[PDB]
Amino acid sequence: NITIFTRILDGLLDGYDNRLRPGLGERITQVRTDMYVNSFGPVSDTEMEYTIDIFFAQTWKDERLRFKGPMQRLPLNNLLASKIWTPDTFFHNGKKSFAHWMTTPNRMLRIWNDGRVLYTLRLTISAECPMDLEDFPMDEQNCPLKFGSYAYPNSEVVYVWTNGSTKSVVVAEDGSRLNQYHLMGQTVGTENISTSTGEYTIMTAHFHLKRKIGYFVIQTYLPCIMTVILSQVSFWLNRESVAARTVFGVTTVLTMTTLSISARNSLPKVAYATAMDWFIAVCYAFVFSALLEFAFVNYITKSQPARAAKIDKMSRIVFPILFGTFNLVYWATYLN
Amino acid sequence: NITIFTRILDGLLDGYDNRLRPGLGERITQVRTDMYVNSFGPVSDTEMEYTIDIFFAQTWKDERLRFKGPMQRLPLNNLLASKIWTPDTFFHNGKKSFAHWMTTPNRMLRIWNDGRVLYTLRLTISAECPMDLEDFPMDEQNCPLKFGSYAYPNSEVVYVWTNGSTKSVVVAEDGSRLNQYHLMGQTVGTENISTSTGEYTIMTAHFHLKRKIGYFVIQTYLPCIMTVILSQVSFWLNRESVAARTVFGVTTVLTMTTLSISARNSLPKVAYATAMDWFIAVCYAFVFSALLEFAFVNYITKSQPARAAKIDKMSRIVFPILFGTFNLVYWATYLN
Amino acid sequence: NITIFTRILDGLLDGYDNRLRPGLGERITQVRTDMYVNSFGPVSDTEMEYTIDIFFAQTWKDERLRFKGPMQRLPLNNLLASKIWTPDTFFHNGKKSFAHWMTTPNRMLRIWNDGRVLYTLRLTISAECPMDLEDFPMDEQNCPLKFGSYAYPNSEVVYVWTNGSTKSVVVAEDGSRLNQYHLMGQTVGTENISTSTGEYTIMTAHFHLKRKIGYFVIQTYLPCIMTVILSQVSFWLNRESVAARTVFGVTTVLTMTTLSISARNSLPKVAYATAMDWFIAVCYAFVFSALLEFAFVNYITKSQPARAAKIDKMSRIVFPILFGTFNLVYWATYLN
Amino acid sequence: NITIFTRILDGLLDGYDNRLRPGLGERITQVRTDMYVNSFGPVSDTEMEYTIDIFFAQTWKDERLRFKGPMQRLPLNNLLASKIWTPDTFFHNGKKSFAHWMTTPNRMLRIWNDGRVLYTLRLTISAECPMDLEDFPMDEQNCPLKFGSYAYPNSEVVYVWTNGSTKSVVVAEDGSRLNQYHLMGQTVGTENISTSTGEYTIMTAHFHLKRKIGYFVIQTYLPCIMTVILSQVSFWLNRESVAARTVFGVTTVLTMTTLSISARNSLPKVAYATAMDWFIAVCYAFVFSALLEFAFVNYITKSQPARAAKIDKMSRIVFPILFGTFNLVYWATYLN
Amino acid sequence: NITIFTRILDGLLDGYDNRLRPGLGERITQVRTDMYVNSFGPVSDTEMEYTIDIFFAQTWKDERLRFKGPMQRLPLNNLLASKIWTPDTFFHNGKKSFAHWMTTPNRMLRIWNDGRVLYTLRLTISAECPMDLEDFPMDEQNCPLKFGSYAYPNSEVVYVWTNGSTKSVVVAEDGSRLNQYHLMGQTVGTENISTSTGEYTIMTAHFHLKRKIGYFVIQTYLPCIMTVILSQVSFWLNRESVAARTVFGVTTVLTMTTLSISARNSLPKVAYATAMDWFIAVCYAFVFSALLEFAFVNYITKSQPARAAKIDKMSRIVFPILFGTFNLVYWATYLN
Ligand SMILES: FC(F)c1ncn2c1Cn1ncnc1-c1cc(Br)ccc1-2
Ligand SMILES: FC(F)c1ncn2c1Cn1ncnc1-c1cc(Br)ccc1-2
Ligand SMILES: FC(F)c1ncn2c1Cn1ncnc1-c1cc(Br)ccc1-2
Ligand SMILES: FC(F)c1ncn2c1Cn1ncnc1-c1cc(Br)ccc1-2
Ligand SMILES: FC(F)c1ncn2c1Cn1ncnc1-c1cc(Br)ccc1-2
Ligand SMILES: *[C@@H]1O[C@H](CO)[C@@H](O)[C@H](O)[C@H]1NC(C)=O
Ligand SMILES: *[C@@H]1O[C@H](CO)[C@@H](O)[C@H](O)[C@H]1NC(C)=O
Ligand SMILES: *[C@@H]1O[C@H](CO)[C@@H](O)[C@H](O)[C@H]1NC(C)=O
Ligand SMILES: *[C@@H]1O[C@H](CO)[C@@H](O)[C@H](O)[C@H]1NC(C)=O
C-alpha cells in the first residue's frame, strides 16, 4: 500500500513547470509566513551585525498539486523540494546567510489534497543592525529583519504574516541567550518599496533589545570611580609632602587615561562621544583638577600659608561631594 | 562470483522510492541510534559553544531492501547512500556542522538479508552550551546535545537509544582532551516537544563537565594574593617614610585594578559578578584599606603620635589574619 | 492558461546555444548596466579593502529570445538563467566575491517580446582600495570599483552605463553606514585597456570617502594634548623638588611613547610618517624639552641661581603658547 | 592511433561496478600506501593541531581493469577516478581536511595491464596533536597521524606500508619549516582496533618533534633573569635611602608578575605548572625576598644597626650566588 | 549566420575524449605559459605566506580541434572548458588556492583553425614563502612560485615560458601595493625533479622583495633611541639625588624591556636573534650600564668623593659618544 503514494506523487510532477508561479496571469499569489527563532545569536557591536537561527516557514496555494487519496497529507523532504516551484525569498538586510545541510538538508515539505503547501526551512543569518550609540550603554537597540521576493513584484507575489501579528513570530525561551543584551519583545510590520523594477512588498520584524548593564560597571565605571577616590586621598596629606602627593595625582591621571583607551577597544570606532565617554571625562577632571590644586597650593605655600591650608582642608569636603552629586544626576538621567 | 552481488543490488533499487519512509501508512518507523565521540572539541566559553566529533550511527528496518543470497551482509559506501531513503536527522541545539568529505565522504552503509539497515556517519558539530557562570571557576557545566527528525513527527518516526542507555553513547579515552575542563560522565534522555507542526521526539545527551582549576590560580589568584602581601609590607616601615609607603599602596592598588581588567578578557562578557570577581574585590579592599590606614595615620601623627604607632603595629597582625581567614572560607565554601 | 507560457518558453530554448553571444559575427553586443548599492560594507584600512553589497543589473538585446504572446514580460528565476547565454562579467579590482544563495539563488531574469533581456543579481564584493595615508586622518580616499568582460574583447562586447551617468549608480540612504568614513558622492567612468588578449572595455565607479574625525581625537590627540599639559605643571614647582619634577617629566615621556605605539596598532603598517605622527613627535618634543629644562636648571642652580629662576618662570609662559600656537597651524592647515 | 586507447578504456568501464571492492567474497583486498610530506604546516599549540600537506598515494590490485595493448601504462586524471572503485580512506585523528581543486582536482590515476592501480592524491590535514607540556619548553612532542578504512573492516581491506617502513614515508628537505619546532625523524606503525563494527586496521605515523629553544629565552627567561639582577642592585645602596630601594623592589616585583601573565598568553591554558612557571616563581622569590630583606633591615636599623649592615653586605654575595647556582641546576636538569 | 558556428563546434566535441592528452603515444605535448600578476597580495610574515592574484594563461596544440570556417577564432567561456582536455596544472609551493566564480567562472577559452588553444584563468594563491630573518629588517626576501603537472611526467607534458623569459611574467604597476615590502624585479626558471613517479618539469618564478624600512624606525628604533637618551640625562644630576636618578634608570630599563616584548609580537616566533634584537640589547646595555654607574658612584661617594665626581662628569661625554658611534656602524653595516 506504498506504491499508491508513488503513483499520486508522479502525477503531480507530470507537466509541473517549476519556472512558473502558481496562478500565473490569473491572480496574485499569496504567501503566508511564520517564524520561530530557535536561538538569537550573538550581537557583534563592532560589525553592527547579529546572528540568528530560525525555522522560517512559508505557505501558499497551488492547484497544480491537487490530488485525491486515502491520506490527507504528504510529508516529504528536500528531495522533492527542487522539483517544484518555490518563492525566491531573500533577506534584504542580510549580509551572509548559509543553510544547514546536516545531517540532511533541513527542509520539510507538506502537501494537502486541497493543494495547500508548506515549505519550512532552517536558516542562519548574519544580519546587520545599525545602532545609534548616543546613549551607550543605556540604549534600546531595535535590530530589524527584512525579507521579500527578489524577482516577483508586489503585483504577483504578496507576503503576509499568518494568524495575525501575534503568533506569527515566536522566540524560544532559551533561544534568547545574549550576554550583554536583554530581549524585551518583537514587532512585525509590512511595507512597500517602489524600486526601479516595480513595487516589492517587504516583511519587517523588529526585536527590541535592552542592553543589560553590569559588565561595564565592573569593567569601566568602578575602576574610574575608585580611581577618582585614590586622588582625593592626597588632600589628607601634609602640604610639604611634595613627592607623596605627586605620585597620587600623576599616577592617577595616567591610569585614568589608559582606561579610556582600553574601554573603547571593545566599543565600535564611533566618531562621536558616548555617555560613558562624558563620565570618563568628568572623572578625568576631578583627578586632573586635584593635581592642579596641589600644584597651586605648593606655589603659594611659601608666600601665603594661611590660605594654602584652607584650600587643602576645603578640598577634602568639596571634591567628594561634587563627584557624588554628579553620579546621582548621571545615573538618574540615563536610568529614567 | 561478483556479478551476483550487482544483480541483487539492482533489484533493491528497482522501484525503490527514496522520498517515502519505510512502512508508510502501515506503522511507525523506529530508529535505533548509537554514538561514539571520537574527540570532544574545545569549549569556547566566549561563544558558549563546544566542538565535538562523533561517529553518529542509525539503524532501522526496511522491508523493501529484503534479499536472499550467499552473503548475509552488504558493506557499501556513500555511493549508494543517496539512492535510498534516510532519516532527515538534524541537531536542534547545533549551530554550524560540516561533514567530512576526505578522502571519500565518510559514510558506511550496511544491509542484512532481513532488511535491517545501518547508516553511520562522521560529524563535526559546533553546538552551543548555555553556561551559568555564577560560581565561576568552581562550576559544573552540563552541555547538552539534541537531535531529531526535521520533517517526520513523533507519530511517524521515533528515535530510541539502542541497547539501553549505558552503551548507547561512548567516549574515547583520549578523545576527552580539554584543557580547562574535566569530563566526568554522560547522560542520555528523551522528550517530546509539541510544536506547531505536531509532536517531535528529541534525543538529548548531556555531558557533565567539571572545570579543572589551576590555570586561574597561576593567572589571577596568585598575582592577587601576592599583590595583597606587597601592600602589607608597608606596615613594617617607619611612619615618617611618607614617600616609601605611598609607592607600595599606590602602585599596589593600580596593579590590583589591571588584573581585574585583564582577567575578564578571557572570561565572557557576563552581566553579573562571579566568585572570582568577589575575591578580587576583597583583595582590592585590603590593599585599598591599607592605604587609608597610612593616610589616616599620617593625618594624626602630628597631633596624637601615641595612637598612631598602636594602629600601625596592630595592622601588622590584623590584615594578614583577615586575608588568611577569608581565603579559608572562600576556598572551603566553593570547594565543597 | 498557464500551459501557453510553457510552450512559449520551450520554443526559446529549442536550439538556443548558450556558448555563443547574441549577434555573433554580425554586430557588437551592447550591454547596459545599472547598480544599486544596498549597503557599503566596512572599510578595512589594514587590508586596504572595502566590502560592498549591490544589486548589479545588466541589459542586452537578443533576437533569439523573440516571442509573441498575451504577456509582454516573462518574470523568471535562476532556474532558466543557466539555460541561456550571459556575459562573463568579472571585477578586475575584486579579491574575493561570493554570491547569495539564500533562500534561493538571488537572480531575477526578465524577457520582453522584443528580445530585450534583464539579468540582475545580488553580490558581495571584498574589493581592494589603495589608500595614500599621507594626510591621515585628514584624507579623502577614492575607492574605485572596476568590472568588465573576461573573455569578450571590446570589439565584441561593450559595457555602457544606462540612462546616463546620473541614475546609473544609486546608493541607499541607510546603506552608507560606515563608522570612520563619511561618503560624499559617486562618479562613474569608462576606459579601454590594451592587454595581450586585445582591447577590453572597463566600467569604473569611484566612491568619494571623507574620513570623519572624532574617534582619533578622543583616542590619540586628547591623551597627547593632556599629556603635554601634565608636564608643564612641573614648571609651577620649586626647583629643589628634584624628585617631584622628575616623576612628571619621566612618567610623561614614557606615557607619550606608548601612545605612539598603541595608535599605530589600528593604523596599517605604512612605511612613512603620517600627519598624526608629526603631531605626536611635536608633543614628544614639548614633554621631552621640559625635562631637559629641569635637568639644565638643576645643573646650574648651585652656581647661578639668578638665571635658574628666570628660565623656570619664563617656561611657564613660553611652552604653553608654543603648543597652543602649533595646534592652530596644524589644525588649520589640515582642516582647509 | 589515439582511438585505440578510447576503445580499451571503454571496455574497462563496461559493467564495472564502483560500489563493490575488488575480489569481493573471494579474498581480502590488500592496499599498499606511501606518503610524501610536501610541507609540515605550522603547529598550533593553543589548538593542539598541526597542519600538513602530503601527496598521499595508494596501490591495489583489480583484475576487472585488466587489458592488453601497446602501452603498458595509462596515465589519467580525476575525470576517470569517480568512475571506478576507490578505498574509503579517512583520517581518524584528523579534524578538518580539505582537498586541492586548483587548477584541476589534484588526482593522478595510473593503470597497468596486469590490473595494478595507483591513486595518488594531495591533501591538507589539520590533525590534532595531544601534547603533554610538563617539561615545556624542553619537550619532545610526538604528533601522530592515523588513517584507515571507514566502511571496510580488517577482514576485507588491509592497509600496509609499501617497500618496508623505511621509504614508505618521505619528508621534503624544505618541507619541514617550523618556527618553534625541529623535526628529528618519523616512525610508522600498524595496529588493529576492535570497534562495535568489527576490527579495523590502522596505519599510524609518528613525527618526532624537538622544540627549538631560543624564542622563549629572548622573550621570557632573559627579561626574568635581568629583572632579578635589577633588584639585587638595591643591596649596593645606603640603608637610609628608603625611597630609592623601595622603587627597585616594588617596581621589580610588579614587572616580574606581568611577565608571567604575558608569557602564558601564547602558551595553552594548561591546568598545571610547567618548567618555565617554576623558573618564574623562583625568580619571583629572589626579587620578593630582596624586598623583605630591605623591609626587615629598615625595621631594625633603629635598634641594632650593627646587624643591619652585616645582612645588607652579606646579601650582596648570597643572592647572586643562589640565583646563579639555581640556573645551572635548572638548565642542566632540563638540557640532559 | 550563427547556426554555422554551432555545427562547427559540435563536430569538434564529436568523439573528443577529454581523458586523453593530445598527441598521445605520438609525441610530447608542449605547453606555453604566460602570467600577469593583477595584484601581489599581502605578505604574512607570521605564516610565511604571500597572497597573489594572477591571470594565469596556457597554450598548447591540439589537432583534434582543427576546423575550417569564415572565422579564424572561436571565443568561448567556461561552458565548453570542461568538455575538452586541459592540463592538470598544480602549484607545488601553494597551500590553499581558490578560484573566482563571480559573476561567472572566470575562464576564457580561444581556439584557432590550426588547432592551437588558449585556456586562461584567474587565480588567488596563498603560497608559502620561506624567509631567513637573519638580517631583519634589512633583508631581501626571494619568494618563489612553483607549478607543474600533477599526473603527466616530463616525458609527456613539458611547460615552457612563452616568448622568452622577459615578457612571460608581467606585474601590474598598481598591483604591487605591499605596505612593508618593495618589489624590485622578477625571475623565471625551469627545473626537473626525479620523484618516485618519474621526472616532472617545474616552472619556477621568483619575486625579489626588498623590505622598505620606516615602520620599525617609528615603532621600535626611535623609542629605543630616545629611551637611551632619557637615562643619560641622569648623569646631569647631583649625585646625592638618589631618588631622582633611581627613577630614570629603573623606569628606563623596564621600558626598554617591554619594547623588546612588544616588538617581537608582530615578528614571527623565530628561534634565533635578528639584527634588531642585537640593537635592542645594545640599547639595553647603555641604560642598564648607566644604572650600574649610579649605583657604583653612590657606593663610593661616602669614601672617595673625588673619583665619584670624575666618573659622573666623564660619563656625560662617554656614553653619548659610544651610542652614537655604535649606530653609525650598525646602520652602515646593514645599509651597505
Ligand atoms: F534594479 C535592480 F537594481 C534590482 N535587482 C533586484 N532588485 C532591484 C531593485 N532594487 N533596488 C534595491 N532593492 C531592490 C530590490 C528589492 C527587492 Br524586494 C527585490 C529585487 C530588487
Ligand atoms: F513550524 C516551523 F516553524 C517548523 N519548521 C520546522 N520545525 C518547525 C516547528 N518547530 N519550532 C521549533 N522547532 C521546531 C521543529 C522541531 C523539529 Br524536532 C522538527 C521540525 C521543526
Ligand atoms: F592574457 C591573459 F593574461 C589574460 N587572461 C585574461 N585576461 C588577460 C589579459 N589581462 N592582463 C591583465 N588583465 C587582463 C584581462 C582583462 C580583462 Br577586462 C579580461 C581578460 C583579461
Ligand atoms: F559504530 C559506529 F560508531 C562507527 N561508525 C564508523 N566507525 C564506527 C566504529 N568506531 N568507533 C570508533 N571508531 C570507529 C570506526 C573506526 C574505523 Br577505522 C572505521 C569506522 C568506524
Ligand atoms: F608519488 C606520490 F607521492 C606522488 N603523487 C603525486 N606526485 C608524487 C611524487 N611527488 N613527490 C613529491 N612531489 C611529487 C609530485 C610532483 C609533481 Br610536479 C607531480 C606529482 C607528484
Ligand atoms: C502595499 O501594496 C498593497 C497592494 O496595493 C496595498 O494593499 C498595501 O496597502 C500597500 N502597503 C502600503 C504600506 O502602502
Ligand atoms: C513521547 O511520545 C511517545 C508516544 O506517544 C510516548 O510513548 C512517550 O512516553 C512520550 N514521552 C514523553 C516524555 O511524554
Ligand atoms: C574605447 O573603444 C571604443 C571603441 O573603439 C571607443 O569608442 C572609445 O572612445 C574608447 N575609449 C577610450 C577611452 O579610448
Ligand atoms: C591485525 O590483524 C591481522 C589479521 O588478523 C594480523 O595479521 C595482525 O597481526 C594484527 N595486528 C595486531 C597488532 O594484532
Ligand SMILES: *[C@@H]1O[C@H](CO)[C@@H](O)[C@H](O)[C@H]1NC(C)=O
Ligand atoms: C629537463 O628535461 C628536459 C628533457 O629531458 C631537458 O631538455 C632539460 O635540459 C632538463 N632540465 C634540467 C635542468 O636538467
